[PDB]
Amino acid sequence: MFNEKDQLAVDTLRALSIDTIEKANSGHPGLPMGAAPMAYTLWTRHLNFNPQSKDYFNRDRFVLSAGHGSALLYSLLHVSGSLELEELKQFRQWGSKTPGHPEYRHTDGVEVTTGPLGQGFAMSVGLALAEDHLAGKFNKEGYNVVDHYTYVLASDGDLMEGISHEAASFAGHNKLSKLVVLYDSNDISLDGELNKAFSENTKARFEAYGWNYLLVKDGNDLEEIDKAITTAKSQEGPTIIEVKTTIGFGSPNKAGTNGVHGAPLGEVERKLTFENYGLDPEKRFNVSEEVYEIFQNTMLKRANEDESQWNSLLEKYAETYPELAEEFKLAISGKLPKNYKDELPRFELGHNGASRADSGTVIQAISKTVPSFFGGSADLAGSNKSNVNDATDYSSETPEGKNVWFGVREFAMGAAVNGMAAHGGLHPYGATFFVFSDYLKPALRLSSIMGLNATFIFTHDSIAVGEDGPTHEPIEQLAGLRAIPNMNVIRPADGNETRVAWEVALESESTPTSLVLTRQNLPVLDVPEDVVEEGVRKGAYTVYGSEETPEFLLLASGSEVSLAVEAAKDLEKQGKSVRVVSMPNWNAFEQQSEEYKESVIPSSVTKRVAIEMASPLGWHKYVGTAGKVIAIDGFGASAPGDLVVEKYGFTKENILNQVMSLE
Residue 225 Cβ, how far from Mg ion at the closest point, in Å?
18
Among 436, 456, 619, 622, binds ligand TPP (CB under 6 A): 436
Query: Which sign, positive or negative, has the C-alpha torsion 503, 57, 129, 446?
Result: negative
186 contacts ligand TPP (rule: CB under 6 A): yes
Sketch the per residue contact string, 335 through 374, with ligand TPP: x for CB under 6 A, - otherwise.
----------------------------------------
For residues 446 and 555, which CB has a smaller minimum distance to a copy of itself in the complex?
A: 446
141-170 residues near Mg ion, rule: CB under 5 A: 156
Residue 31 Cβ, how far from ligand TPP at the closest point, in Å?
4
Q: Interface with ligand TPP by CB under 6 A: which range of 153-161, 295-303, 482-490, 510-518?
A: 153-161
Residue 167 Cβ, how far from ligand TPP at the closest point, in Å?
14
Q: How many residues does the chain have?
A: 663
For residues 111 and 166, which CB has a smaller minimum distance to a copy of itself in the complex?
A: 166
Going by the annotation, the residues of the binding site are: 28, 68, 115-117, 156-157, 186, 188, 261, 356, 383, 436, 460, 468, 519
Supply the DSSP string of 82-122, one letter for each residue.
SS-HHHHHTTT-TT-SS-SS--TTTSTT--S---STTHHHH
For residues 243 and 563, which CB has a smaller minimum distance to ligand TPP in the complex?
A: 243
CB atoms within 10 A of CB 617: 16
Residue 376 Cβ, how far from ligand TPP at the closest point, in Å?
13
C-alpha–C-alpha distance, residues 484 and 456, integer Å: 14
Binding-site partner at residue 66 among ligand TPP, a copy of itself, Mg ion, none, CB < 5 to 8 Å by type: ligand TPP
Among 27, 109, 157, 636, binds ligand TPP (CB under 6 A): 157
Q: Interface with ligand TPP by CB under 6 A: which range of 115-123, 139-147, 514-522, 616-624?
A: 115-123
Among 27, 37, 99, 116, binds ligand TPP (CB under 6 A): 116
Would you say 13 and 292 are in contact if contact means Cβ atoms under 8 Å apart? no
Among 197, 208, 408, 483, binds ligand TPP (CB under 6 A): 408
Counts for the chain of helices (H) and strands (E), in that order: 27, 18
**Can you give the three-state secondary structure of 229-263, one letter per residue?**
HHHHHCCCCCEEEEEECCCCCCCCCCCCCCHHHHC
Among 186, 239, 559, 587, binds Mg ion (CB under 5 A): 186
Please give the single-letter amino acid code of residue 104: Y
Would you say 98 and 188 are in contact if contact means Cβ atoms under 8 Å apart? no
Q: Interface with Mg ion by CB under 5 A: which range of 40-48, 183-191, 334-342, 509-517?
A: 183-191
Element (H, E) at 267: helix 267-277
C-alpha–C-alpha distance, residues 391 and 52, integer Å: 38
CA angle 317, 323, 325 (to 5 degrees): 40
465 contacts ligand TPP (rule: CB under 6 A): no
Residue 498 Cβ, how far from ligand TPP at the closest point, in Å?
22
Among 61, 68, 97, 423, binds ligand TPP (CB under 6 A): 68
Residue 251 Cβ, how far from ligand TPP at the closest point, in Å?
13
Residue 585, φ and ψ in degrees, nearest 5: -125, 110
Binding-site partner at residue 498 among ligand TPP, a copy of itself, Mg ion, none, CB < 5 to 8 Å by type: none
Please give the single-letter amino acid code of residue 180: V
Q: Interface with ligand TPP by CB under 6 A: which range of 9-17, 82-90, 149-157, 311-319?
A: 149-157
Residue 116 Cβ, how far from Mg ion at the closest point, in Å?
16
- What amino acid positions are annotated as catalytic residues? 410
Q: For residue 59, with 0-12 CB atoms within 10 Å meaning exposed, 13-18 middle and 19 or more buried, which class applies? A: buried
Going by the annotation, the residues of the binding site for Mg(2+) are: 156, 186, 188
190 contacts ligand TPP (rule: CB under 6 A): yes
For residues 340 and 405, which CB has a smaller minimum distance to ligand TPP in the complex?
A: 405
Residue 30 Cβ, how far from ligand TPP at the closest point, in Å?
4
Closest by CA position to 362, among listed 339, 378, 385:
385
C-alpha–C-alpha distance, residues 413 and 440, integer Å: 8
For residues 350 and 382, which CB has a smaller minimum distance to a copy of itself in the complex?
A: 382
Q: Interface with ligand TPP by CB under 6 A: which range of 27-35, 72-80, 290-298, 545-553?
A: 27-35
Would you say 232 and 241 are in contact if contact means Cβ atoms under 8 Å apart? yes
Residue 167 Cβ, how far from a copy of itself at the closest point, in Å?
8
Query: Which sign, positive or negative, has the C-alpha torsion 637, 642, 643, 648?
Result: positive
Would you say 184 and 66 are in contact if contact means Cβ atoms under 8 Å apart? yes
Q: Interface with ligand TPP by CB under 6 A: which range of 185-193, 308-316, 363-371, 420-428?
A: 185-193
For strands 578-582 and 541-544, give the pairing: antiparallel
Binding-site partner at residue 470 among ligand TPP, a copy of itself, Mg ion, none, CB < 5 to 8 Å by type: a copy of itself
For residues 41 and 113, which CB has a smaller minimum distance to a copy of itself in the complex?
A: 113
Q: For residue 395, with 0-12 CB atoms within 10 Å meaning exposed, 13-18 middle and 19 or more buried, which class applies? A: middle
C-alpha–C-alpha distance, residues 17 and 489, integer Å: 40
Among 16, 188, 420, 457, binds ligand TPP (CB under 6 A): 188
For residues 207 and 379, which CB has a smaller minimum distance to ligand TPP in the complex?
A: 379
CB atoms within 10 A of CB 329: 14
Residue 131 Cβ, how far from Mg ion at the closest point, in Å?
28
Residue 542, φ and ψ in degrees, nearest 5: -70, 130
Binding-site partner at residue 382 among Mg ion, a copy of itself, ligand TPP, none, CB < 5 to 8 Å by type: a copy of itself
Going by the annotation, the residues of the binding site for thiamine diphosphate are: 68, 115-117, 157, 186, 261, 436
**3-state SS, residue 272:** helix
Burial pattern 201-218, b for ≥16 Cβ within 10 A else e, equals: ebeebbeebbbbbbebee
**3-state SS, residue 35:** helix
Strand partners, 185: 244
For residues 469 and 602, which CB has a smaller minimum distance to ligand TPP in the complex?
A: 469
DSSP state at residue 500: H
For residues 333 and 471, which CB has a smaller minimum distance to a copy of itself in the complex?
A: 471
For residues 523 and 636, which CB has a smaller minimum distance to a copy of itself in the complex?
A: 636
Would you say 490 and 501 are in contact if contact means Cβ atoms under 8 Å apart? yes
CB atoms within 10 A of CB 566: 18
Would you say 214 and 241 are in contact if contact means Cβ atoms under 8 Å apart? yes
Closest by CA position to 212, among listed 243, 186, 236:
236
CA angle 273, 274, 280 (to 5 degrees): 165
30 contacts ligand TPP (rule: CB under 6 A): yes
28 contacts ligand TPP (rule: CB under 6 A): yes
Binding-site partner at residue 173 among ligand TPP, a copy of itself, Mg ion, none, CB < 5 to 8 Å by type: a copy of itself
Going by the annotation, the residues of the binding site for substrate are: 28, 261, 356, 383, 460, 468, 519
The residues that touch ligand TPP, with contacts defined as CB under 6 A, are: 28, 30-31, 66, 68, 115-117, 155-157, 184, 186, 188-190, 247, 261, 379-380, 408, 436, 439
The residues that touch Mg ion, with contacts defined as CB under 5 A, are: 156, 186, 188
